Amino acid sequence: MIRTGTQYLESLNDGRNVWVGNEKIDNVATHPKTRDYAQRHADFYDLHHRPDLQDVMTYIDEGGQRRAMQWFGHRDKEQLRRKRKYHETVMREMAGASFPRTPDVNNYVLTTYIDDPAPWETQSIGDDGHIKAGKIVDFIRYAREHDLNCAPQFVDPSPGLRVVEKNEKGIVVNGVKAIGTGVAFADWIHIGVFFRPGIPGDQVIFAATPVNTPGVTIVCRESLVKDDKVEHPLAAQGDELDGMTVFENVFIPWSHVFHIGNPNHAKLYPQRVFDWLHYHALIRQMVRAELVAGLAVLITEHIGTNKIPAVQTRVAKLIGFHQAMLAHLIASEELGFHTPGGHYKPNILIYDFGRALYLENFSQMIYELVDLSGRSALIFASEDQWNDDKLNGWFERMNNGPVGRPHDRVKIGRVIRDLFLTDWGSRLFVFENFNGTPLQGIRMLTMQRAEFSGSGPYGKLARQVCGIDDYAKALDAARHQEEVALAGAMA
Amino acid sequence: MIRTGTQYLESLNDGRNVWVGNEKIDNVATHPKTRDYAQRHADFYDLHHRPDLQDVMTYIDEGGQRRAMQWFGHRDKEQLRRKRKYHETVMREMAGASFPRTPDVNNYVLTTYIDDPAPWETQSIGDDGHIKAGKIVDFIRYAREHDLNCAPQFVDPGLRVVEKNEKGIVVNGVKAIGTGVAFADWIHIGVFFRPGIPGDQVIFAATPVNTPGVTIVCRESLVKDDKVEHPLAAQGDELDGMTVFENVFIPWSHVFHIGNPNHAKLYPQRVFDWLHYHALIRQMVRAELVAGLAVLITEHIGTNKIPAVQTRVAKLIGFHQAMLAHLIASEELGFHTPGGHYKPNILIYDFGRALYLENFSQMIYELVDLSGRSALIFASEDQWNDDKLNGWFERMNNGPVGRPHDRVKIGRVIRDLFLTDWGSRLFVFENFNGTPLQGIRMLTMQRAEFSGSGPYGKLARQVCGID
Amino acid sequence: MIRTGTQYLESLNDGRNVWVGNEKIDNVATHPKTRDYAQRHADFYDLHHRPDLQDVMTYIDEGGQRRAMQWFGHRDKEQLRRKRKYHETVMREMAGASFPRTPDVNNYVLTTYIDDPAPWETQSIGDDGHIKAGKIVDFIRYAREHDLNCAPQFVDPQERSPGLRVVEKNEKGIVVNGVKAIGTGVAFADWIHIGVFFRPGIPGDQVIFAATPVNTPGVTIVCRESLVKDDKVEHPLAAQGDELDGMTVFENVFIPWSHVFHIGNPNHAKLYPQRVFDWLHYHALIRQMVRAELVAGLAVLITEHIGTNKIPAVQTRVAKLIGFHQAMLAHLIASEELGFHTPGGHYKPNILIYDFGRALYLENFSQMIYELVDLSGRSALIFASEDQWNDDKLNGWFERMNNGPVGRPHDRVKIGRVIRDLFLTDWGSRLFVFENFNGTPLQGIRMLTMQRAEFSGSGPYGKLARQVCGIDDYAKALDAARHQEEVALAGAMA
Amino acid sequence: MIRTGTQYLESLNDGRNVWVGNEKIDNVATHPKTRDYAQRHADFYDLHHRPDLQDVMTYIDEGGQRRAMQWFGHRDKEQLRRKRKYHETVMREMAGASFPRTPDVNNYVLTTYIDDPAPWETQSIGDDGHIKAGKIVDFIRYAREHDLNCAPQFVDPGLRVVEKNEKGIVVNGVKAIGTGVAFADWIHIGVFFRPGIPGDQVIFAATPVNTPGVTIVCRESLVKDDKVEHPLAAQGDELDGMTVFENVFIPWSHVFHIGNPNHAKLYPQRVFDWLHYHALIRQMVRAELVAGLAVLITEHIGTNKIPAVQTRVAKLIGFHQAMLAHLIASEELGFHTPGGHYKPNILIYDFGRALYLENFSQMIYELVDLSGRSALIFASEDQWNDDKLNGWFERMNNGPVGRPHDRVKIGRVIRDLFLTDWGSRLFVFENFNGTPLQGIRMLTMQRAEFSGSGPYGKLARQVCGIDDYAKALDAARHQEEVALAGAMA
Question: Using the beta-carbon criterion (under 8 Å), do A313 and D311 form an inter-chain contact?
Fold first, then answer.
């Protein structure tokens, strides 16, 4: 049976040590500061029990068990599209993709271990042979069974998390994981790291631990949730907190340790892990661009500016941005490739270039919407003002346009305001540069590779115009994923 | 005399009808949603009593009385620059130009009536002789005498004249745009001509904020509760809103002009010119603040040495220098008005406004992106000082310069300015601090001195061999 | 057979009346201002005979005959990709896509007539029943058989317009008089393919679709000066010849009814000519992807050759030229994936996605080329001429000035020559300016899209916003040209 | 008298060794590939003799001698404005700023030596005291008295001193970048500091263009033949190239400084200041020409009342006014140099340039786009006049303003300026007419006064609740500091 929201809310009250701003949180499910977002997670779970969404939200596995599509492994392009349609439906249903780290996103990442668990073991160092690939798989199967949200914590800002003790039982780790999103709302924390030049071996740690593990403290920014859901129909729905996690002599048994000790392993295997979350981000970006275009269509129509040609071309601009996101996503899916375990993975270069295009232009596109909406964005009637005997008539006449009731202008502006002109909405704006690797990151790590050099495919045409000049074979399986993706793109 | 902050606050308790969101405000000076910004207006009066600021904030008038620099008329360039320096000083003292309709701005606008009152009287249609130019002047003099905040409401079911008699006029309708009217003394009514406007909707007058029939209807307050976490946004929200006039009575003495669509083409723009020149002063100071925060935050993190960040920060500095170039060339290439006031060059300060409104939003994104994680995710104060968390926070916020807590200091200011409702409003307001970006271009281009017969044509015509 | 470049060149000496600048052209095949681009068309034909390119360049039609792929009709996505593959090969082989209006592009557009010929005839007004659908298809079979180049002239700038109009109708034909103001390569084509787009108020006598030979009496082709360069060592691309642009003047030109495809109906001229030019737009996107590939390629080569390629600030600029090419690719591949069938069963790529692909290029290419020019530094402007490079005193200086980590020093000149021709000569500038006329421009893409109901709050983009704000088969359609647009959007949004 | 164009052309025939592309040049003054640009130099000199312009173009010194304004020392703001009006008049008179390195620009830069000669001498290393400040000044006085064009070559196989004796130095190597050198009288040798620059490459000097062992190697000439079809590009091409120095001897009298990498840090910036000011004067005029061409073409077609068109033209007009604001503000907030010259605010005109360099591409692209098909496809003159075509071209080119042929006139100038090789060189060269966008930003930000302890720090720190050339050890460093203080108060 698939986890219910009610079971989720209950599980949160587990003694987890959480700060939200200045306050200590006794129960994340009920504290006024967290409880709207927690309920968003509960609704996530209850979407898997909605009769009308069953086709999209669930699957029957080979054992005959109905399971949430968040665990669904895709081995070809048609299966990939079915998964995307799941993620898309989840975010469309949940305030138009305002919650980017629902558990379906968080858990997508575990697909990499399952696909190819052995290198995580075999490349481990400092280990005394205790880590086992089979136990990595066992943990993921356990998560899937209980529908557990495993919040990933990989990025670092010497306070980084490190091994301070090793015995026959497991490891002790001490330090800080600087970035985490929604961890106070998860069941487990998924610890990882990305390579940086000179990363010490005792900082190379991949593992999992419960959110209430003793010595774990979750320190989150203040909550931006709004009280009044009528003035703030989106920002009153909860705030997906970001924060840091402190680990004070936290013990992790070897069974839940995936890898330690190998800096070269940290060069490409973590990228492979975060690939799934990057692909998810582009789906999200597409949906956000559709929402932004759509709001410009609704507001310019209700104001009556829609038929002004100047405005027509700017709206067409917002629609084109959405189509660019869809073109990268679709193309990424068409030109995917099989991973060593035989999952099908969309093309990494195309969907990351999708992301870079979004991260580059989304500011100006939002600014366009805000500007198109004039005063209707910020200065509109509160509800009581609108329904007041003396004010109502004035408000009706100042918001009359061609298409529909005058109050629909207020309804539109409340959304534009919540998404783009509140702290809550601004958090989303900013998070986008932290939802996987930033713009500058995509471009840097792509351009360091030998297949984007004059020797590579991009040099070939320019060379002639100028008159110049299988994982069995491949020795690095996760490097091969990068090369095979350019193969597919440039053919 | 010179009004104090205390007298100001007291004056707000006058039975004015104000909505802020759903709430009715009993008293704008003490209500939890309005009192912080009220206090900012109080700070503004008290500024003119600060002994170190007296040379900058006040002049001696012809009569011998010390007057607030908001009432000073600049008759040449150096006087203009004295006034700018006053406006600049006010906004630098008051939260880095975070409050754009302080009383010095609102009242700047009255220069146009004083400079040349007559045409407002003589161009009136349908007043049967009741409106008197000298009465316009006496009102402004009155306003001067008591340091009264006349809040302008021009931009537009709009307000119309429903009854004329021998005592005054009666007005009924809405003035849909107004900023900080709940904090002002008087409302200054005006209008801009639009194609096929009627004589009964052309109205310039002044009326008290608590005039019977007047209802100020303001958006919810965005003021923050906790000044430590939010050092700027706790300081008060300059409310925007509309004003409803339910058959409101204004005497002829306090009516400046009625009835003439033609007058509403040119003369209201001459009123708002002062607001636009002030707009660029402010935009320069916002640009300077943004550049300074990019330097502080790149220097605290230690990314300021990375050549890619250098060029990004230089660009912010350059934008400030572009605001300054426009402001300075506008003052340099100004001209005398009919009554012999010196006015900055309309064309140059407005292209200056155009440039800000076209680029501000990418310049802010640049500060936000440079600041990285330090804008959304930083320690609250209690987190910071917690005996368990203090040592981790200090280690994470360490870098070359200063003390680790300065990061949070800088972070709170960036957050408040650009990542709060409160800050976002100042963002949206710039598109409504006078005429919007598309309007500057359009009102410039509809005049024939930017046509091919104008000065822009001349070099092009010579190079082309044209006539 | 398949026509040969020799056959083509011989065919140009047919007495056509051609101005190229101040000069009259006796013979396009041999005149100094035209002969190089003529030979580029000769090379196009010969490319089809190259044994190593037979599978790319040719097919066997139903009736057992080997024809050039320019005539191939693609009925599914995999056949579509074969057609794209052919257009890519042609443009890669011909100076990195510097000749945008080769015959394969011009004739691609005839597919719309073959697909669904009847409406051209049934929607005609004022022809007194003389026009037959069958005859459009017959002309096209005739063009195909002789591999004839049909250059399209549709685009235009009341009783004062100079645009082509019908001034006589009789039992034999029509007589047209006036101007088709834009034309690319017409002086080098076999036939002029005449069309028009709807404009508000267009009179019926200016709605014309037809074909006449380029040497028809009364036809004059008036082209801009030729920008071809004399020295092909200093200018290895712009010595290859100049695809002339120009207008065509028609003075009482007789066209027989057999060669008239449609007259009279302004409503027909609004979507049907968009359906003809969809094929040209799709091809424009294929070219746009290759041009981007070249721009990014040149940028890699020059930054590597100078050694600036490792500077991080430079790296991010080249990544962005690389992402642009990938943006073009993505639109192209997506458009192929979400394509649809036309009435007559052709597979067409998704109109909306490839047009948005073009808008993205048209909006950004200018900045992108500026990047390349800026990254290449002084190597664009100042480099050695060939004799300078080989001079006994200068050579030692030039080698030491042009050294760096990759290749031979003279390769910087080789790269410089290409950047200079492509982006810093008259010849390259025309191509730059032509990108905005190679199909309805950026402004047109956005306006034609937004006038349609499916981009209103009533169509698919309204739906998610309305829910978040808490608000609230060609047989069965009447206009088949319209329904292509509705089907394209449904496939894009589902 | 002031030099005449005639005397200048005669002077070109001095046996200088010039490549233009593959050809050697017998006489820059008469060769088809260079004679038109040479005549534009001759025209520069003849402007100074025109009686309707000599109040702008010349001044009387206190000896009663009429001198070309290119030599005029400005000591205050009004005098700087007269100099600027002169440079402006020159470039409006010569094909709308299409000739960026006329002699007035080249020679402006000598102002710095004259202002403060002595550090060039005193900070020299390895010259055994042979360099004398008095001889630096005498050279500039000579240049001035004969109205000689000293073309600067500074930016970098580099030129190195290979021999030092009692008469002078011998230099060997390449000065990679040079504009118009083949049309000049003297070459002004310079260098900018770069990390690890050896003393033997620190050289400031003057040598005649025809000096033995100098070869001028220029790119091919971009000049067009038909001045009807090409009214600007027919007027000559301002060649770019490198200058090869083969064991070239320079007398100590014409050496200004050698040896000191420290001197190369800021003093070269101080020389180029003046050219950078001039670049912004030129950028304003190019902006003006671009904006007016926009007004002319949209007007002649009729697109000028389409509101979307109007806003784009307003943007070109804004860009012009932005260059003018920086220009005016630089002049307003200027300062005196050690020698008493008044110099515009270095930071403000350099930011003006930055602004231009960042945006000119897009602004020119707007004009080309707005100009439509009228850019590329328009009638040649014989087409236009032909008896059969005339009627068609007139009707196609009718609109609300002026004669139909005026669209061809506007087209020809837009074509020359932005769609030919010739115009394209002017496009690319913008980025070389002084330190490029990247350089302005980078050497600004390495200066301590743009840090958090300088005036940008002040407002930020407060809102965040945080916390005379005699005194100065470096006169050329002091100018920068003074420039910022004047801009920020």
Answer: no
Alpha-helical (H) ranges within B380-434 are 381-385, 390-396, 405-418, 421-430
CA distance C157 to chain D (A): 8
Domain boundaries, chain D: 1-271, 272-489
Say if residues C18 and C24 touch (Cβ distance below 8 Å). yes
Helix/strand/coil (H/E/C) assignment for every residue in chain C: CCCCHHHHHHHHCCCCCEEECCEECCCCCCCCCCHHHHHHHHHHHHHCCCHHHHHHHEEECCCCCEEEHHHCCCCCHHHHHHHHHHHHHHHHHCCCCCCCCCHHHHHHHHHHHHHCCHHHHHCCCCCCCCCCHHHHHHHHHHHHHCCCCEEEECCCCCCCCCECEEEEECCCEEEEEEEEEEEECHHHCCEEEECCCCCCCCCHHHCEEEEEECCCCCEEEEECCCCCCCCCCCCCCCCCCCCCEEEEEEEEEEEEHHHEEEECCCCHHHHHHHHHHHHHHHHHHHHHHHHHHHHHHHHHHHHHHHCHHHCHHHHHHHHHHHHHHHHHHHHHHHHHHCCEECCCCCEECCHHHHHHHHHHHHHHHHHHHHHHHHHHCHHHHCCCCHHHHHCCCHHHHHHHHCCCCCCCCCHHHHHHHHHHHHHHCHHHHHHHHHCCCCCCCHHHHHHHHHCCHHHCCCCCHHHHHHHHCCCCCCCCCCCHHHHHHHHHHHHHCC
- CATH class of this structure's domain C277-494: mainly alpha
**Domain D272-489 part of CATH 3.10.310.30:** no
Question: In C, which residues are within 8 Å of D215 by CB distance?
Answer: 393-394
**C-alpha radius of gyration, chain C, whole number:** 24
Which residues from chain A sit within 8 angstroms of residue C285, using beta carbons?
Answer: none
Architecture per CATH, B260-467: Up-down Bundle (1.20)
Architecture of domain B149-259: Beta Barrel (2.40)
Cβ B228 vs Cβ B416: under 8 Å: no
CB atoms within 10 A of CB D32: 12
Both tokens assigned to A338: 């099989």
C-alpha torsion sign, points B273, B274, B280, B282? negative
Distance between CA atoms of residues B96 and C76, nearest Å? 64
**Homologous superfamily of domain range A274-491:** Butyryl-CoA Dehydrogenase, subunit A, domain 3 (1.20.140.10)
Residue C157 neighbours by CB under 8 Å, 6+ apart: C163, C181, D396
Alpha helices (H) in D52-205, listed in sequence order: 54-57, 77-93, 103-108, 111-115, 118-122, 133-145
Q: At what angle do helices C268-306 and C77-93 cross, to 10 degrees?
A: 50
Which CATH code for domain B1-148? 1.10.3140.10
B384 touching chain D per CB within 8 A: no
Closest by CA to D173, choosing from C400, A166, B200, A241, is C400
User: Looking at chain D from residue 63 to 122, which residues have their Cβ under 8 Å from any Cβ of chain C?
Assistant: none
- How many other C-beta atoms are found inside a 10 Å radius of the C-beta of residue D51? 6
Chain C residues closer than 8 Å to D382 by CB: 21-22
User: Do the first three CATH levels of B1-148 and B149-259 match, i.e. the same topology?
Assistant: no
Give the resolution value in Å: 2.3
Are A141 and A208 spatial neighbours (Cβ–Cβ below 8 Å)? no
**CA-wise closest residue to D401 among B246, A299, B461, B341:** B461
Token pair 């109109």 is found at C351
Q: Kindly give the residue spans of alpha helices, DSSP state H, lying in A183-308.
A: 265-303
3-class DSSP assignment, residue A206? strand
Angle between helices C411-424 and C351-376 in degrees, nearest 10: 130
Which chain A residue is nearest to residue C319, measuring alpha carbons? A443
Interchain pair B307, C313: CB under 8 A: yes
